[PDB]
Ligand binder design. Sequence first.
Ligand SMILES: [Mg+2]
Ligand SMILES: [Mg+2]
Ligand SMILES: [Mg+2]
Ligand SMILES: [Mg+2]
Ligand SMILES: [Mg+2]
Ligand SMILES: [Mg+2]
Ligand SMILES: [Mg+2]
Ligand SMILES: [Mg+2]
Ligand SMILES: [Mg+2]
Ligand SMILES: [Mg+2]
Ligand SMILES: [Mg+2]
Ligand SMILES: [Mg+2]
Ligand SMILES: [Mg+2]
Ligand SMILES: [Mg+2]
Ligand SMILES: [Mg+2]
Ligand SMILES: [Mg+2]
Ligand SMILES: [Mg+2]
Ligand SMILES: [Mg+2]
Ligand SMILES: [Mg+2]
Ligand SMILES: [Mg+2]
Ligand SMILES: [Mg+2]
Ligand SMILES: [Mg+2]
Ligand SMILES: [Mg+2]
Ligand SMILES: [Mg+2]
Ligand SMILES: [Mg+2]
Ligand SMILES: [Mg+2]
Ligand SMILES: [Mg+2]
Ligand SMILES: [Mg+2]
Ligand SMILES: [Mg+2]
Ligand SMILES: [Mg+2]
Ligand SMILES: [Mg+2]
Ligand SMILES: [Mg+2]
Ligand SMILES: [Mg+2]
Ligand SMILES: [Mg+2]
Ligand SMILES: [Mg+2]
Ligand SMILES: [Mg+2]
Ligand SMILES: [Mg+2]
Ligand SMILES: [Mg+2]
Ligand SMILES: [Mg+2]
Ligand SMILES: [Mg+2]
Ligand SMILES: [Mg+2]
Ligand SMILES: [Mg+2]
Ligand SMILES: [Mg+2]
Ligand SMILES: [Mg+2]
Ligand SMILES: [Mg+2]
Ligand SMILES: [Mg+2]
Ligand SMILES: [Mg+2]
Ligand SMILES: [Mg+2]
Ligand SMILES: [Mg+2]
Ligand SMILES: [Mg+2]
Ligand SMILES: [Mg+2]
Ligand SMILES: [Mg+2]
Ligand SMILES: [Mg+2]
Ligand SMILES: [Mg+2]
Ligand SMILES: [Mg+2]
Ligand SMILES: [Mg+2]
Ligand SMILES: [Mg+2]
Ligand SMILES: [Mg+2]
Ligand SMILES: [Mg+2]
Ligand SMILES: [Mg+2]
Ligand SMILES: [Mg+2]
Ligand SMILES: [Mg+2]
Ligand SMILES: [Mg+2]
Ligand SMILES: [Mg+2]
Ligand SMILES: [Mg+2]
Ligand SMILES: [Mg+2]
Ligand SMILES: [Mg+2]
Ligand SMILES: [Mg+2]
Ligand SMILES: [Mg+2]
Ligand SMILES: [Mg+2]
Ligand SMILES: [Mg+2]
Ligand SMILES: [Mg+2]
Ligand SMILES: [Mg+2]
Ligand SMILES: [Mg+2]
Ligand SMILES: [Mg+2]
Ligand SMILES: [Mg+2]
Ligand SMILES: [Mg+2]
Ligand SMILES: [Mg+2]
Ligand SMILES: [Mg+2]
Ligand SMILES: [Mg+2]
Ligand SMILES: [Mg+2]
Ligand SMILES: [Mg+2]
Ligand SMILES: [Mg+2]
Ligand SMILES: [Mg+2]
Ligand SMILES: [Mg+2]
Ligand SMILES: [Mg+2]
Ligand SMILES: [Mg+2]
Ligand SMILES: [Mg+2]
Ligand SMILES: [Mg+2]
Ligand SMILES: [Mg+2]
Ligand SMILES: [Mg+2]
Ligand SMILES: [Mg+2]
Ligand SMILES: [Mg+2]
Ligand SMILES: [Mg+2]
Ligand SMILES: [Mg+2]
Ligand SMILES: [Mg+2]
Ligand SMILES: [Mg+2]
Ligand SMILES: [Mg+2]
Ligand SMILES: [Zn+2]
Lengths: 140, 22, 204, 174, 37
Amino acid sequence: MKTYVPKQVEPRWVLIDAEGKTLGRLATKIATLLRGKHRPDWTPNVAMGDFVVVVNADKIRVTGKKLEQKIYTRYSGYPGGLKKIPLEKMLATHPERVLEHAVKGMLPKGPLGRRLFKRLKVYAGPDHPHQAQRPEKLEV
Amino acid sequence: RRIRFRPPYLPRPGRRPRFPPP
Amino acid sequence: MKGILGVKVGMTRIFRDDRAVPVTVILAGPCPVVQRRTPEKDGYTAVQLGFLPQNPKRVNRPLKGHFAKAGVEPVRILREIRDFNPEGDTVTVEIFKPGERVDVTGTSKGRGFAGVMKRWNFAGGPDSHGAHKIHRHPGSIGNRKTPGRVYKGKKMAGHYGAERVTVMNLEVVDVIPEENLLLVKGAVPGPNGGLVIVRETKKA
Amino acid sequence: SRIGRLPIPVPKGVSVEVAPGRVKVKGPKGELEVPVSPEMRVVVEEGVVRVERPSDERRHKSLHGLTRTLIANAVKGVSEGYSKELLIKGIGYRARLVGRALELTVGFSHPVVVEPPEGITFEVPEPTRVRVSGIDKQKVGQVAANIRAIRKPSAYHEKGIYYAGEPVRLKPGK
Amino acid sequence: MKVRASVKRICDKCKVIRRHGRVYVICENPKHKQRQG
RNA sequence: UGGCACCUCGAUGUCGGCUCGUCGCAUCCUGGGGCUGAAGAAGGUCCCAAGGGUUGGGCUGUUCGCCCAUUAAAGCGGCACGCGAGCUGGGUUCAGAACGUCGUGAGACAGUUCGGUCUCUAUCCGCCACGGGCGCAGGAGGCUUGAGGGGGGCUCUUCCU
RNA sequence: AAGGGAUAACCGCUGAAAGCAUCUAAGCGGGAAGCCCGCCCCAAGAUGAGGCCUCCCACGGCAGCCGGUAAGGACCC
Ligand SMILES: [Mg+2]
Ligand SMILES: [Mg+2]
Ligand SMILES: [Mg+2]
Ligand SMILES: [Mg+2]
Ligand SMILES: [Mg+2]
Ligand SMILES: [Mg+2]
Ligand SMILES: [Mg+2]
Ligand SMILES: [Mg+2]
Ligand SMILES: [Mg+2]
Ligand SMILES: [Mg+2]
Ligand SMILES: [Mg+2]
Ligand SMILES: [Mg+2]
Ligand SMILES: [Mg+2]
Ligand SMILES: [Mg+2]
Ligand SMILES: [Mg+2]
Ligand SMILES: [Mg+2]
Ligand SMILES: [Mg+2]
Ligand SMILES: [Mg+2]
Ligand SMILES: [Mg+2]
Ligand SMILES: [Mg+2]
Ligand SMILES: [Mg+2]
Ligand SMILES: [Mg+2]
Ligand SMILES: [Mg+2]
Ligand SMILES: [Mg+2]
Ligand SMILES: [Mg+2]
Ligand SMILES: [Mg+2]
Ligand SMILES: [Mg+2]
Ligand SMILES: [Mg+2]
Ligand SMILES: [Mg+2]
Ligand SMILES: [Mg+2]
Ligand SMILES: [Mg+2]
Ligand SMILES: [Mg+2]
Ligand SMILES: [Mg+2]
Ligand SMILES: [Mg+2]
Ligand SMILES: [Mg+2]
Ligand SMILES: [Mg+2]
Ligand SMILES: [Mg+2]
Ligand SMILES: [Mg+2]
Ligand SMILES: [Mg+2]
Ligand SMILES: [Mg+2]
Ligand SMILES: [Mg+2]
Ligand SMILES: [Mg+2]
Ligand SMILES: [Mg+2]
Ligand SMILES: [Mg+2]
Ligand SMILES: [Mg+2]
Ligand SMILES: [Mg+2]
Ligand SMILES: [Mg+2]
Ligand SMILES: [Mg+2]
Ligand SMILES: [Mg+2]
Ligand SMILES: [Mg+2]
Ligand SMILES: [Mg+2]
Ligand SMILES: [Mg+2]
Ligand SMILES: [Mg+2]
Ligand SMILES: [Mg+2]
Ligand SMILES: [Mg+2]
Ligand SMILES: [Mg+2]
Ligand SMILES: [Mg+2]
Ligand SMILES: [Mg+2]
Ligand SMILES: [Mg+2]
Ligand SMILES: [Mg+2]
Ligand SMILES: [Mg+2]
Ligand SMILES: [Mg+2]
Ligand SMILES: [Mg+2]
Ligand SMILES: [Mg+2]
Ligand SMILES: [Mg+2]
Ligand SMILES: [Mg+2]
Ligand SMILES: [Mg+2]
Ligand SMILES: [Mg+2]
Ligand SMILES: [Mg+2]
Ligand SMILES: [Mg+2]
Ligand SMILES: [Mg+2]
Ligand SMILES: [Mg+2]
Ligand SMILES: [Mg+2]
Ligand SMILES: [Mg+2]
Ligand SMILES: [Mg+2]
Ligand SMILES: [Mg+2]
Ligand SMILES: [Mg+2]
Ligand SMILES: [Mg+2]
Ligand SMILES: [Mg+2]
Ligand SMILES: [Mg+2]
Ligand SMILES: [Mg+2]
Ligand SMILES: [Mg+2]
Ligand SMILES: [Mg+2]
Ligand SMILES: [Mg+2]
Ligand SMILES: [Mg+2]
Ligand SMILES: [Mg+2]
Ligand SMILES: [Mg+2]
Ligand SMILES: [Mg+2]
Ligand SMILES: [Mg+2]
Ligand SMILES: [Mg+2]
Ligand SMILES: [Mg+2]
Ligand SMILES: [Mg+2]
Ligand SMILES: [Mg+2]
Ligand SMILES: [Mg+2]
Ligand SMILES: [Mg+2]
Ligand SMILES: [Mg+2]
Ligand SMILES: [Mg+2]
Ligand SMILES: [Mg+2]
Ligand SMILES: [Zn+2]
C-alpha cells in the first residue's frame, strides 16, 4: 500500500490580527500555516498550505530592548554597502517588512519556500483588500 | 613593514625556449 | 516650484556693469499644459508640459488622442515638472525674472566609449622611462587572493556622456518674453539644439 | 525614611480625580495630569491623597516614592504655583522683557531672545533678576535651566547667569 | 573626566553612581569625576 | 624579530617605485566634548567621531629616514609586507670583470663595484560598458511613482563684532 | 550645503529605591564634519515585473492552432 497523495486542493484563506502579538512567536505559526503542516495530508513537495493574511502589523510587539537594538541588515555588493537599519526605524517606515522578514526566514529556502512566501499577505492597519476571498479569522 | 631583508625565492625570468620539438 | 521645457540655442556673453557675463541662451516657452497629475488620480502632483509644435500628419492615433483630450494642438515633446501646478494652461518664460537663480537639466554630450583617462581623470602611464604600452591604461584593478575579485563600481573605461546631467544654481541674467528667451549665466549640458529643462533652483 | 508612605495634604479646594494610569489634579492655578504606574494605587481620602505599593519588591519601592512626589508636586503647583529666579551677574550683563518674552544681554555680539513655552511666565523685576514662574514644577526648572545655559557662570569671574541661591565658587587666574 | 578600569572614590565627598549601565563617580571636586572604561 | 614546518618545490615571481584603490581606527587634520598646574590667546591630557581631507622639492634603489619650502593636517596600519596574465626593473640570484678579504689552489663573501633577455591573442568568475531573448494574461503609443542603489561629504584666510 | 529628524561622548529637568543626594529605576530636555532624510544620478527582471493618459476590439475554420487585419511596429532608405 503506497502512501496517500492529495490531488489538487483549493487553498483556504485565513486571516490573523497581528496586534500586540509577540513578533517571532506569531511568525512560527504563520509558517506552519504556510507550509501546510496543520493539514493531515501534508505533502512536502507541493504548495498545499494556506494563504495567510495578517493585519495590524504596525502593532506587532516585542520584548527586551529589541526596538532600539535589533538591527535589520542589507548588503549592496558595493564597497562600504552594509546597511544597518534598526527595528524602531523599520516599523517607522515599512512596518509590514518586520513580520514579513520574520516569516521569510522561518520558511524553507528553495523555490517552493519562495512560493510559500508569496502566499503571505501582510498589511499595516486594520484593513486588507482580499474581501473577495472571504478570509477565515484565526486566533492564534 | 618587514626589516629582515626578504631575499627572493625565485630567479627573475628568464632564459631560452625549447624550440622546437620537430 | 516652477519649471519649463526649452531648447538650448548657444552662448555668448553680455556686458553688465562693466563685466562680461558668460551666458547660455535657451528658447523656453511656450509650453502648453497637456496633463495634470493629481494625488487623487495619480498619487502625486506635477504638470505634463508639451513643447515644440508637431506636424499632425506625424502624430499617431494613441498620441493624437492624448493631445485631443487636453484640447491642445500637437507637440513634439512631453515632459513633466514635478510638484508644479500652474494657474494657466500654458507655461512661458515669464515665470522667471532676471536675478532669480535656477537649475538646468539637459543631456550631456556623448563621448562614446571613453577611456579611463577621459572618463575618470586617471593619471595614465609614464610616456617614457620604460613604460611598455600602458600610457593610458588604468593600472591595477585589484588586490590578490583576498579579496580575489573586483568591486562593483570599479572606475573603468566605458560609455561616457549622453546622460542626464542637472547643473544647479545658475543665475537668470535676463528674460526676453517677446522671443521666449532665457539667458542663464554660465553653462548647461548638451549640444546647441539639445532639449533642456529649466526649474526653479533648490539651493537656498 | 519613607516617601511613598507619607500622605499628601490636599488644600481646599484642589480636585484630585483618579483614573488608571493617571491622576488629574485641578486647582486655582489650572490643571495638571500626572502619569502614574498602573502598579500603584492612588487613594483619595478626605483632603488627602495617599499612594500604595503592592509589595516590598525593589521596583515597587522605587515606583512608590516617585509616584507620591509627582502627585504631591502637581498638587502644590496648581495651588501655590512653582518658581525659580535667575540672577544675572557680570558688568555689561542685564536682561529686559520684550513683550511676553525674555531678552538676554550677556556679552555676545547679539542679544539672545527667549520664548516662553506654553505655561511659562517670564518676569524681570530688576534688570539683573529674572523669574521663571509656572504651574509645572518640571517645566519651570527646565526653562530655568535653559536660560542659565545661555551663559553659564564663569569659573574665574563672577559673571554669567546664576541661579538665585547659587554659590559663587571661583578659581585663581595667574 | 578620568576614564579607567578602576573607578573608586578619591575623597570623602566622592560618590559612586551607576548611570545607564555604566559606573561613574561624581564629586564636588571636578578632578574626581570618573567614568569606567 | 623569532619559533614551528601544515597546503603549495610536475613553480604561490619575490625589494622599491608607478598606477588604481579599498578597508581598520589604537584619529594627523577638520566636527563634538570632560579635566586642566584652563585668566585670554595658545596648549596639555583623556573621551566621542572614519564624512572628507591628509602638499611640493633635495639625498639615496631604497622602504625608512634626514633635510628645504609650505600646511588645517602633512596619521598609523590591513588587504600574498594590496596591486609584474597592469607597467616598471633602479635593487636583491645566474653566466663577464675588478677591488678588499679568505683560501697553496679551483675558488669563496647576511661585502663593495660596472654590466647583464620581464612572455601580441582572456575560456570561466569578477569588473566597466552595450545589446539580443523572453517575461511582466488582450494587444499598442506616450508619460511617470521610486522599493532599492550609487554619487557627494574637504578646508583655509581676512574683515565686521 | 541649508534644512528636518534620531544619536555619540558629554551636559542637564523632574525623581525615587536610600526622609538627604542622584541625568534614571518612571518620564522629559540639550548634544557631533559623523547617522536618517534632504541634493544629484541609476532604477519595476521591485518575477513583490507598480501607476496615469490615450489608441485598437468583439476576424474568419477546426487558457489550442491556423489565416487575413486593427492600433501600432519592424524591415529598407
Ligand atoms: Mg495552529
Ligand atoms: Mg514525500
Ligand atoms: Mg509603508
Ligand atoms: Mg536543508
Ligand atoms: Mg531631457
Ligand atoms: Mg560621439
Ligand atoms: Mg584609458
Ligand atoms: Mg571627466
Ligand atoms: Mg584631464
Ligand atoms: Mg601623473
Ligand atoms: Mg600623462
Ligand atoms: Mg616618464
Ligand atoms: Mg623593457
Ligand atoms: Mg610607448
Ligand atoms: Mg573572496
Ligand atoms: Mg549612450
Ligand atoms: Mg540686462
Ligand atoms: Mg555645443
Ligand atoms: Mg479630597
Ligand atoms: Mg487598604
Ligand atoms: Mg588608581
Ligand atoms: Mg576615602
Ligand atoms: Mg555630588
Ligand atoms: Mg619563523
Ligand atoms: Mg611542510
Ligand atoms: Mg617552509
Ligand atoms: Mg610551509
Ligand atoms: Mg615551492
Ligand atoms: Mg602543471
Ligand atoms: Mg599544478
Ligand atoms: Mg607552473
Ligand atoms: Mg598565481
Ligand atoms: Mg603571478
Ligand atoms: Mg592603504
Ligand atoms: Mg578607512
Ligand atoms: Mg576610538
Ligand atoms: Mg578638535
Ligand atoms: Mg580639551
Ligand atoms: Mg581657552
Ligand atoms: Mg596658563
Ligand atoms: Mg595662560
Ligand atoms: Mg576624558
Ligand atoms: Mg571622557
Ligand atoms: Mg575619516
Ligand atoms: Mg583612509
Ligand atoms: Mg627624491
Ligand atoms: Mg639637481
Ligand atoms: Mg628616500
Ligand atoms: Mg639620484
Ligand atoms: Mg646599496
Ligand atoms: Mg636609510
Ligand atoms: Mg592650530
Ligand atoms: Mg613628504
Ligand atoms: Mg605580488
Ligand atoms: Mg603595503
Ligand atoms: Mg607587495
Ligand atoms: Mg608587487
Ligand atoms: Mg613583469
Ligand atoms: Mg614589484
Ligand atoms: Mg598579479
Ligand atoms: Mg597572476
Ligand atoms: Mg596597467
Ligand atoms: Mg646599480
Ligand atoms: Mg641590476
Ligand atoms: Mg654577473
Ligand atoms: Mg675593481
Ligand atoms: Mg688584493
Ligand atoms: Mg672573508
Ligand atoms: Mg693563503
Ligand atoms: Mg693569498
Ligand atoms: Mg656556497
Ligand atoms: Mg651598456
Ligand atoms: Mg648589479
Ligand atoms: Mg612582463
Ligand atoms: Mg620589455
Ligand atoms: Mg584569441
Ligand atoms: Mg571571455
Ligand atoms: Mg570560474
Ligand atoms: Mg533588456
Ligand atoms: Mg529587448
Ligand atoms: Mg519615442
Ligand atoms: Mg503610485
Ligand atoms: Mg531611495
Ligand atoms: Mg535587486
Ligand atoms: Mg545636519
Ligand atoms: Mg534633537
Ligand atoms: Mg535635582
Ligand atoms: Mg542613604
Ligand atoms: Mg529611563
Ligand atoms: Mg532630546
Ligand atoms: Mg537624552
Ligand atoms: Mg540643557
Ligand atoms: Mg561641511
Ligand atoms: Mg524609468
Ligand atoms: Mg528617472
Ligand atoms: Mg514594468
Ligand atoms: Mg528580492
Ligand atoms: Mg507596468
Ligand atoms: Zn571626591
